[PDB]
Amino acid sequence: PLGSEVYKGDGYKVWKLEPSLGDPLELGRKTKTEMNAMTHDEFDRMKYGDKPSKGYDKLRVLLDLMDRPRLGTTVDLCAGRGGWSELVKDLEGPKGITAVSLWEEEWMADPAIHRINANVKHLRPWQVDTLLFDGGEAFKRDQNLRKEENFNDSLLDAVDAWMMQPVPPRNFVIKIQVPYTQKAIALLEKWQVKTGKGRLVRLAGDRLSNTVMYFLSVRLETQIRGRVTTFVRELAERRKDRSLT
Ligand SMILES: Nc1ncnc2c1ncn2[C@@H]1O[C@H](C[C@@H](N)CC[C@H](N)C(=O)O)[C@@H](O)[C@H]1O
């Protein structure tokens, strides 16, 4: 019998993403343009307190997908209100966490968690057991597409320094807000070479109004370009399905 292996246990939690043919940047820009043109009706129909934020439960699902590793010294980059840091603190205590964010957003997590008020694009890395990053922003419709792409590429370039240091993080959870840019795909491929690990996932039930994926330190899953292509094609189809009659 399959036994306990049944519970971990991928089927329910993330999209199946086998690689397919196509240009992910062209397809991503196409579906973003279509979404920008949607009516209130269309857009609304598919755009759809215990914790410091809704991020706590999200990180719990991701860490379970990773077989619940021991976290050790952890940096939480772009910590915001602290949902991810609070999860780490509940798991292992406050001592091993450093939270980095621009609080200029107020901290809703344990005040015992060490915090650094800094731009993650300026802060230089240090050696950690676990690297967490939940930065990234979806832009509103009125703006040009390349602006959103460049903003999120810049954040990813900040994470790159943490990943490429001489002793990289053993565990990592990296939010990829815009995964179909040339830079995002090149960065993910590079981190797979550096670490020998890493799989890009789309979480089931994430909002269709965004293009968010998560890069997780589970076993290597390669062909990232084709899997992003599959993701953006399927996303455009599910946006169409939801926005319609
Ligand atoms: N360049 C930057 N440096 C530091 N923090 C940033 C930067 N850009 C955005 N942020 C912050 O990153 C946060 C992103 C949030 N999604 C984090 C949520 C957090 N994971 C939670 O569970 O509550 C926002 O609070 C932003 O204020």
Author numbering: 38 to 85, 95 to 150, 154 to 294
Authors' account:
Sinefungin (SIN), an analogue of the methyl-donor SAM, is originally isolated from Streptomyces griseoleus as a potential antifungal antibiotic. It contains a C-NH2 group to replace the S-CH3 group of SAM and has been previously identified as a potent inhibitor of flavivirus MTases. As expected, SIN readily binds to the ALSV enzyme, showing an affinity (12.6 ± 2.8 μM) that is similar to those observed with SAM and SAH. We further determined the crystal structure of ALSV MTase in complex with SIN at 2.0 Å resolution. The structure was solved with Rwork and Rfree values of 0.198 and 0.226, respectively. The electron density for the bound SIN molecule was clearly observed in the SAM/SAH-binding pocket. The overall structure of ALSV MTase bound with SIN is nearly identical to those of the protein in complex with SAM and SAH, showing an RMSD of 0.292 Å and 0.246 Å, respectively. Its binding was stabilized via a series of hydrogen-bond interactions, involving the MTase residues S99, G129, W130, L148, N168, V169 and D183.
Alongshan virus (ALSV), a newly discovered member of unclassified Flaviviridae family, is able to infect humans. ALSV NSP1 is a typical flavivirus NS5-like protein.
